[PDB]
Symmetry: C2
Subunit: 373 residues, 2 copies
Amino acid sequence: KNPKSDKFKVKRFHHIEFWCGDATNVARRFSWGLGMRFSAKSDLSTGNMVHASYLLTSGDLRFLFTAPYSPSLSAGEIKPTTTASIPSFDHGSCRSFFSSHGLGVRAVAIEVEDAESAFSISVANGAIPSSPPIVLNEAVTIAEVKLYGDVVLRYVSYKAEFLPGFERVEDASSFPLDYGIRRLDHAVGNVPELGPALTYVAGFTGFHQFAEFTSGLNSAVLASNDEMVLLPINEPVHGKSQIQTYLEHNEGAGLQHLALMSEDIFRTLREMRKRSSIGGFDFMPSPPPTYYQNLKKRVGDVLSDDQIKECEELGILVDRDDQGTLLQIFTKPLGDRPTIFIEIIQRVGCMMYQSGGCGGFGKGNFSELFKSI
Amino acid sequence: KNPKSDKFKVKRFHHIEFWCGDATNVARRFSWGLGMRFSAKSDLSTGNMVHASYLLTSGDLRFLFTAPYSPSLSAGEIKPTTTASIPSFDHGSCRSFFSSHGLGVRAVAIEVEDAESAFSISVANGAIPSSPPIVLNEAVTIAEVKLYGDVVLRYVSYKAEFLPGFERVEDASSFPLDYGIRRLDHAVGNVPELGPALTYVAGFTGFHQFAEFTSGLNSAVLASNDEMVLLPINEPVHGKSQIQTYLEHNEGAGLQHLALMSEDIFRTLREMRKRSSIGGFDFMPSPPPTYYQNLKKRVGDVLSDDQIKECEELGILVDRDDQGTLLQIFTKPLGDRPTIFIEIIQRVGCMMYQSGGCGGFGKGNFSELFKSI
Ligand SMILES: [Fe+3]
Ligand SMILES: [Fe+3]
């Protein structure tokens, strides 16, 4: 059920920050592959001598790509005189994260009412502090606590897009790509031990268990009061588990997958699949045909036969619980290592606004895929 | 003139290797932006537990993108038992290069008759050894010496594409992109002091001075016997020079630009410019119109008025020496730092095969751009 136990007021996912080697190349690949618009920047051209940061947006989804410049450009700065636009940035931590884990998510950012308040209450309730509340241009407050591994939960609060110090991208350079992606649905972490990770995060946030699963993994989902911030966590089950392989290749815990909601998953997948081999993202191998014939059966009130055939053309998976229906598909790993990947999703049902997490997370697609094969 | 002084037999440029944070994302961005085909790989799927390496090709141009996995996957290997396909690879050097310089070229690779012989003679003649000759699957020999900064000159020789241990990419994943790029024309290094860098490299190769220039830089070009391997080197001129800015942002000397020959520079630029804002490469600001009106004058026997207007539509620059004509244009930096960039070029003249370096390197486009502005 839903105790509505949050320890502070949380609004919505706000942004995901990637720590990269070269922000430029990752941002440009992602823009093209996912259909996100180049919308803001913080770098040498805006007077940032510390880090290069590029923001891509699609609907309300915000992806930020950051890399460190040579320390030598800002060696004379101190925290009080910094030209960095994200005060929590550290060359050393960034290089260290990237060396250890390769390309991946550093920050899962949520918008809250009062970032100073959320930080204070989180730490008071057991959160490990990462970067203290700082007010940027008397307008925005940012703070960070450890989530799992070297991933931080970042709190953002606005007095009245992006951050101060970021410049909006002029239309010539800002081509309006858009393949239908609209918001972040969920962000999932892989950890060695689920129990303690749940205890820790639910401990400092007050997020309640929305779900659990028990072929490879045990998992559980933590959610905010209105269930619009959703944070699933997986552990491996030994006696490889895919979660175990992740941990080995990533050098420990970290973010496993980002699930992006599409307002039209058919159009999103047509557009992404067109570009897979020409700079974009590859997709995991499709289910056999026997999976699609079996879908007539499970979701017949939801999707017509032609709508199911469209799923089969795009390799979309469909799952259905008590209350709603889930369309989903997974990309292959986003970079060199077999670590982070993306999920594209769309939800049918639970209408009122649509209830966060309608249809679950696809845990029925486990048995159903291996039944078809 | 041309003394044909090479100390060993050199054939052609063979490949350029980029050291990246995530090879996958850079390779996919480059493939799409430059129209190169994904043609070979060495990674976890081929049993390489040490590095991820992806090869893109367009005509004879070969771009290789490499990143290190977690050291933990191969911690039990020793050099004699390695699963790496490029024996010279080192996790530590790779991470160190990348931390220090960001995304950039590690190796300028040339095909020679005998790589063991070229290495021996180079070192005997003052080259600083980087990795000794190793024979791969009794079929290919690879060796490396220092070129400038942390860039190496790599020698490759074949008994009878790519390397052993690399697998060819299956056609489904190998989309046949092609925007007209066909081979590497030249590879340019930025160094603090030109004199000593020339002395060193000409010292160990026997390459002769093809050229020199003397607004910002002093430069000189070294070339092989048949002038098909061309290696220009720049130094800054103080009292910023763009070469100086490079050095600061790159943390010292390294590769400045790669010049890619196109069999149709108009088509290449149409295709690249279409994709700049959708995952591809941005281009430096175009010359004013006054530059194009002035081209009627300088190159009237080479290009018609409509051919010149096509140059103006694409922002192409044209330069012309004693013997030939050069069409060229420069991309903006390829990654986060204001360091490495790409040049697209096509040459008219010097026909026999076309003479290496026909038309020079565009040093006339210096005064001519600032005359138009
Ligand atoms: Fe998911
Ligand atoms: Fe050049």
